[PDB]
Design a protein around this ligand. Sequence first.
Ligand SMILES: CNc1nc2cc3c(cc2[nH]1)N=C(N)NC3
Ligand SMILES: CNc1nc2cc3c(cc2[nH]1)N=C(N)NC3
Ligand SMILES: [Zn+2]
Ligand SMILES: [Zn+2]
Lengths: 366, 366
Amino acid sequence: DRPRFSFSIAAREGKARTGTIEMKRGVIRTPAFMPVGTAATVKALKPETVRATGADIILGNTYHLMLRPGAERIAKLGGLHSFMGWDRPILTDSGGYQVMSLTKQSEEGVTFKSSRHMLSPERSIEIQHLLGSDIVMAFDECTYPATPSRAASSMERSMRWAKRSRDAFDSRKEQAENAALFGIQQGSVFENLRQQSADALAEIGFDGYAVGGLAVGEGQDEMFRVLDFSVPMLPDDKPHYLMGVGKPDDIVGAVERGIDMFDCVLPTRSGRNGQAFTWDGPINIRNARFSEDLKPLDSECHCAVCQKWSRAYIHHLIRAGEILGAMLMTEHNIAFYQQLMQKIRDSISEGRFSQFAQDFRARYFA
Amino acid sequence: DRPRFSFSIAAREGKARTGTIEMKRGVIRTPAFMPVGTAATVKALKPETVRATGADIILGNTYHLMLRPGAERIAKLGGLHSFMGWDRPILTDSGGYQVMSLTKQSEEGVTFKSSRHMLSPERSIEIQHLLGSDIVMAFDECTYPATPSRAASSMERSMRWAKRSRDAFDSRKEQAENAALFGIQQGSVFENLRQQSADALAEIGFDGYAVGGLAVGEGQDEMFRVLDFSVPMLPDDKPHYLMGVGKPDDIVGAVERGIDMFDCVLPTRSGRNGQAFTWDGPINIRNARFSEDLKPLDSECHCAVCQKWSRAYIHHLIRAGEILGAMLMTEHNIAFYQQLMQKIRDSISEGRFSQFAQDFRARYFA
Ligand SMILES: CNc1nc2cc3c(cc2[nH]1)N=C(N)NC3
Ligand SMILES: CNc1nc2cc3c(cc2[nH]1)N=C(N)NC3
Ligand SMILES: [Zn+2]
Ligand SMILES: [Zn+2]
């Protein structure tokens, strides 16, 4: 058999780590990038295509699926894995962030209109149980910028909700035996609050630790500044998950600061919009300069799109609003992200990650 | 090597025929259904997926590609096959119909606004040469309903244009050696005009013969009535192509009347709109009755979609406007159409096509 959750670090370089998380439904190579599958689909990609790009795990959302099609309904249809045809690990967010960004707070939970609903640690854990997710996120309260006093109250409530999330998860035998639970560090940009948050979470004990409250419009310099002191407070021997990050350069700098796990909509969303990621930086394939360009999107990429189709053809499809345009751009961008994570993992294992990061930034921002 | 164009009839039943067209880029099993690839894509499908459904040949359009991206541009990029990544036969329409349905006529040609352009037999043949299409359609003038006198003038002009199409095609050595040319019968619903048209075309001589002027809002009874006398006027030993047809029942009845080749947008367009074809008739997958239906779209279909995904999941994707919804619905519907053509071909070969048509209509309209 396979283990419920086992994280092993095979190599380090500075604060960077590379290794594996073994779970019942598969192995997750870290640092890992999770394609986002908001509405039980990674947009414009079959699951086999997601897997073909190298993805080991995808992200689903408690918030969208509890509304459409409904958590009980998904459970009746056999669970999210069966429903969408992805048989590998799935991490589900708790709904705390999407409840905010997409409405009455209290100590019990949140009530909101999407058309009237309530979420709580207990209800959030139960929804993720019904979905059958492999990595369950604790339910948290999100707020930026915010005063030291506001961020402290909001961090404190999240810590009380983390303990309730822990207890609700542990009360469900099948969930506790087959899934893993991650806590979410809060505290905004304030070091002392981040430390109190880390301590709270470590005293409860989780399988992994997310850094929340970033990637909310703070700029990379500030984000790195917070990661600089925040990540070392977390348990070293557990995975570190930076929620909602991000651009390729953000990912590289976050790995240099000890992050193991990432998710964001940028490769999928900006793909459909005409932005393709390349080692030479992003390009807008709608630009007229690509109309007769026979080169593939990226001259080194190994993905199926770059083996078969020219920039000129993809230029034409996107300008025409053709669905195949969105498919090919999305496949290429997800492949790019996975190739980036692969190169990150190999360079750490080989002890040349610093040189990789230097070489990557020189070429990408040339 | 392979032949330029060789049609062989392997079996007959009544007026129905089954066989093969061998061309340089591949073999076309007949009766054949051509998925429509308007803007150099079969909407929402990779070419490998089109081929996986059973398609031997696809249809492209002189009218759309001469505007976007341009015929000379496609030729500079290596031809339509290379551009879109389909290496098998492509039939291109001449632009006559789309010029009408999507503006000054004369004996020389048509001038029109899409933004100002002109088409003629000579220009149409040259565009299809630049595209590299394998089956070239003659350029014709289209008009319904229309008086006997109007249809006769319009049929007469089309016949003069067919001879100019023939001469332009024959003047281009590489085209005449590697591609095939089809004439288009006109004459509206009038038997005498259809006969004069057939005679005109047969005196010129073509590799195949299309029936034009149908599938323009005439109803199936009238269409069958026209096919009843029209198809027998065409050369028996050449393929018979019914342009723009059609619904599954239309196809079956047209094969019973001697048609070998078909194209229409219905499987692709109505796929994206939520209509799925099944042996039990079409279904609208958006309907609430499918929200918890774990069966595949069709319980006999062998396509990849019906092997992996439930009606409930596809219901959810289409209701959410997800691209994967359009992909799966389109793949299934194109697979359905190809499975229909396969069952037609096998039943004719086995001499039980009449029984197939009976059994098909009983179940499909139950
Ligand atoms: C796109 N930015 C982003 N920042 C996040 C931060 C969090 C999150 C998701 C995020 N996405 N999920 C939570 N449950 N809480 C913290
Ligand atoms: C959808 N109906 C339809 N009827 C057609 C009839 C013709 C055609 C395309 C059609 N499509 N192309 C031509 N060049 N002429 C006759
Ligand atoms: Zn690529
Ligand atoms: Zn199917």
